[PDB]
Amino acid sequence: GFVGLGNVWRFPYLCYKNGGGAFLIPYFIFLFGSGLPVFFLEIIIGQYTSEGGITCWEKICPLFSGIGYASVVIVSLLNVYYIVILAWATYYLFQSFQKELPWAHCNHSWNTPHCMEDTMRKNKSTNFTSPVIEFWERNVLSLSPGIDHPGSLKWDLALCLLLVWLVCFFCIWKGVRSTGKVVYFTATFPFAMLLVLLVRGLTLPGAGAGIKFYLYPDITRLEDPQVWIDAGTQIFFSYAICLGAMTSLGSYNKYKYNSYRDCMLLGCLNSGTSFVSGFAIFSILGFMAQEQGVDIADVAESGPGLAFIAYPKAVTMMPLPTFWSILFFIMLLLLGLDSQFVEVEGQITSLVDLYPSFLRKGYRREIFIAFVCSISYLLGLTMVTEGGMYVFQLFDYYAASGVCLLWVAFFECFVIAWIYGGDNLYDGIEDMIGYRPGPWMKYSWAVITPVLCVGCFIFSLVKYVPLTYNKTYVYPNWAIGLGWSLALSSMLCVPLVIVIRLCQTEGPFLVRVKYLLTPREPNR
Amino acid sequence: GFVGLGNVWRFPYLCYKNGGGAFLIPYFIFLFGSGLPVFFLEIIIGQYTSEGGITCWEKICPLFSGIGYASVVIVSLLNVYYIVILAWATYYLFQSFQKELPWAHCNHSWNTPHCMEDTMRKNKSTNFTSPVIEFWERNVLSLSPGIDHPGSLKWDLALCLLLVWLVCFFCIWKGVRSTGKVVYFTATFPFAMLLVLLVRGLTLPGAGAGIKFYLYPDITRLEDPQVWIDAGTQIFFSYAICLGAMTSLGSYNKYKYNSYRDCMLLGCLNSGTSFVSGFAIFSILGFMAQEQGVDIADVAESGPGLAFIAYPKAVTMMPLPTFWSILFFIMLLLLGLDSQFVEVEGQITSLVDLYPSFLRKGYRREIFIAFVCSISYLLGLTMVTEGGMYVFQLFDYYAASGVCLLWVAFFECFVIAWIYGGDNLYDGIEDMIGYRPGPWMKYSWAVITPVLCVGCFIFSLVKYVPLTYNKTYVYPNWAIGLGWSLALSSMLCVPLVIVIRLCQTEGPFLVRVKYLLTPREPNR
Numbered sequence A, B: 001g002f003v004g005l006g007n008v009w010r011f012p013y014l015c016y017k018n019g020g021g022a023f024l025i026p027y028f029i030f031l032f033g034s035g036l037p038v039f040f041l042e043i044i045i046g047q048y049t050s051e052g053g054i055t056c057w058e059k060i061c062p063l064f065s066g067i068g069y070a071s072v073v074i075v076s077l078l079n080v081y082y083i084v085i086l087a088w089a090t091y092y093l094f095q096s097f098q099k100e101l102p103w104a105h106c107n108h109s110w111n112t113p114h115c116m117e118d119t120m121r122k123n124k125s126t127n128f129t130s131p132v133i134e135f136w137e138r139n140v141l142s143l144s145p146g147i148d149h150p151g152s153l154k155w156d157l158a159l160c161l162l163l164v165w166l167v168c169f170f171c172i173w174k175g176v177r178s179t180g181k182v183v184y185f186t187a188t189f190p191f192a193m194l195l196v197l198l199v200r201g202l203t204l205p206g207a208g209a210g211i212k213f214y215l216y217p218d219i220t221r222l223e224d225p226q227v228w229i230d231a232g233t234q235i236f237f238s239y240a241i242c243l244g245a246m247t248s249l250g251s252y253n254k255y256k257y258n259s260y261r262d263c264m265l266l267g268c269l270n271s272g273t274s275f276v277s278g279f280a281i282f283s284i285l286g287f288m289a290q291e292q293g294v295d296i297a298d299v300a301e302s303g304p305g306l307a308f309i310a311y312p313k314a315v316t317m318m319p320l321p322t323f324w325s326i327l328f329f330i331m332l333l334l335l336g337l338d339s340q341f342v343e344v345e346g347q348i349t350s351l352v353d354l355y356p357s358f359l360r361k362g363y364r365r366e367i368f369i370a371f372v373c374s375i376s377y378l379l380g381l382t383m384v385t386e387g388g389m390y391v392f393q394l395f396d397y398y399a400a401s402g403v404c405l406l407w408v409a410f411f412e413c414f415v416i417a418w419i420y421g422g423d424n425l426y427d428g429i430e431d432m433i434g435y436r437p438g439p440w441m442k443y444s445w446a447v448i449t450p451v452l453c454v455g456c457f458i459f460s461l462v463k464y465v466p467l468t469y470n471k472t473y474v475y476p477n478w479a480i481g482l483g484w485s486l487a488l489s490s491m492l493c494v495p496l497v498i499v500i501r502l503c504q505t506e507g508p509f510l511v512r513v514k515y516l517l518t519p520r521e522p523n524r
Ligand SMILES: CC(C)CCC[C@@H](C)[C@H]1CC[C@H]2[C@@H]3CC=C4C[C@@H](O)CC[C@]4(C)[C@H]3CC[C@]12C
Pocket: A208, A209, A211, A212, A215, A275, A276, B192, B193, B195, B196, B199, B200, B203, B317, B318, B319
């Protein structure tokens, strides 16, 4: 279940946004420096404590327990916008049940008269747009001029959003497993369809330029600090780390269990599939580039939904457009639904034991399931509006990416490396997994991750570039302040809990900090 | 370790030889009818008996125990020629240690003056040959006019053959594990390089025609019975079934072990990698087809070594030819060496307990290791000669493929389905794997496999077409008789043992057959 939408949507969009292969160098650097390190860190914390996200930190250190609450805020904010991605896929699937796909040609009402089939884009107001972009913006999104103009709500997406929310609600309400029936179909189908797209994508006449764009890096983009943050957060996003799910996932694992092999295996496949999937989508872009006579960096739309622009273009070029289009949206929806079933249930599982005596399992719990879904439905309803795409971009860049992931990832390593000690963790690890691992992990949590986290944070601050959508829309100042509020909401959690914890322990600050620094029953 | 030279070399050659996608329909039919069925059959026999190839049949049925000896003959004959494939790869690797690859251009001594670089083939004695083919036939094989002309021995291959034989001898002699050190590098590297070739192969300008050739079938070829036999034996070859290795492999498995999941998983990946690998090599052929202005069915050489013609052509188009060429031959040699380490040690392990009191572990055993390797070295030395390629084709088509695999596969199912009973096996299976499986297996061993095995055998006999090499060389009558002798050697083992055992049990034939039909201590 390592495959998610991030690997097929977030990764391609981020890599496309950040030049070409210039994304890869920070991507693999962050992978081998922190990603697998912090992934194993959370997994082994879960195994050592056999406890949940917030509470395992309490076991490791009563102070700096705000990391757990920060994770809850991130997962909550993530679910609010992650579901809207599934809403688009569901709408596309519904539109893929018609004989001729709507985006195959642009002669319908919503298409701007300046549209022209990609086949004639080069064959024949110099700026000519494509049907695939038109359907996504003038039909699926009804893009408004700006975030300051919300406009009329699009009920089509709202209904699709309600459906996916209801599917998620019932699955959690009825304790339905994340993978339905046999896990194989839920597993091999994403691989099969991805390989179907890859074979089609590579075979495309323009795939050569796309792969060269995909792999050959640009050192100039490395100077811009945004690529380092995005690559670092990409890994943080795809592995679903710093959200408390992996700590819960490691909880179920037995004390005597070789989680090291699982983490490095599941870690490399999750990134490996993303890298392979990057070949397919970027191969499409090269084909679109030469067919349209437009540069690869400008042939697609640099906003979330690159998976909704290049991949539906491939299914159009597939032997049976309708057949393949339906299957793609099925696997796309499948990769998102299973993620939601696990990540949504994580916070309620985190919330139910967070505030007991009121959320007892049963009547109190069942209404809470709808309560979480409904409030998050109204909040997720904002992205449905015509200008809700821009709000979505703020949620993607800030709520569960950007500085927020770096800050929490830093404190996860900062606590374990110094307050708890990387050497002290190995003593449990060799007891648990049976053998003491090498020095790659210890020198990553203590040095590589803290250096990478702060350096990206600091260089971001001095070289501050405001967030832009489609590299052409400048956000208003208030929206950036609103966007930072989501990030500040999660990051402020750690310091806030520290102050509360210190107050609880009346006494000299030094005595109080030392008292609560002591780990409390780390393992049983 | 499911990947072998069968998936990277045997499948491409067979598919290429038997038209295009017309190979696939019998391929998947035989897969789902017998391949996974007989694979699980041998695995579950090994698990139920926890005993070796010959002896497990004795447990199931003292009569029809010749299946074990037939497997020994097949594995022995297979090892004699399988090693010569590694000898070619080793020679290619040695030739890949030079700055410029020898087959990149044809201006050397061995190249016929009628050769012309593929780049100039279409750009410019109408039949013009290519350097890649020239290097393989002239420098690597020194192809003689016919099998009736052996000619001078090529010492280069003989030395390479001795080296791989010595590597195999020492690994078995020192009990070295099949996978050296960490299994990961022995495992992920074949996948990585295969995916490197696939990305390069698909990106090639002519990959479109090759995939269409690969997938779109021809019903006319289905009439020819040779495609059904080759597809059936391809599955039998790639899974290394009907050789007694899987029976030994299933022996190590615990009685309470879900081998069903392992078999269907390892079964589908082994065929899945072969199918994916077929895309890469056939993509190359389409690129060679359009660059040479020659049909895909005639652009390569229809003899064993298609992996030595298309794949080295691919690395000549990769960014670092020498770098990738060395890596390819490394993974090619890796896919063969590990197979030899396991399949060679299988027969000595089968021979040592077959004739005890003389092959005791130690001084008697160690000289036997060289004795098996040396005799098989002299026998494998025949394919090294200039005309030894044709002898190799006889070994490929007859010794461990063709009718020989069908006959033994038939009797494996014929014994279990009728003499032992498919229902009786399930009673153990539900006790072992914990749950009774479906009716797909039982109706395959009793109906699908026996119908497929005999039907291919019968239609082969009535529509007899003599074996040909490169679709242009007609073998002499004596060579076919020699070739059938290898096949008749293995198949005749079954009836021979039956007569010997019937003699052992003096009495009425009906009483004797019934007495030895009774299973003897099937499980402990
Ligand atoms: C899945 C992992 C192993 C990555 C896939 C392969 C990696 C190693 C990359 C590195 C360099 C790459 C090559 C670099 C340049 C080109 C030229 C282009 O016109 C076709 C693709 C091709 C030939 C690339 C194929 C893939 C490649 C070999």
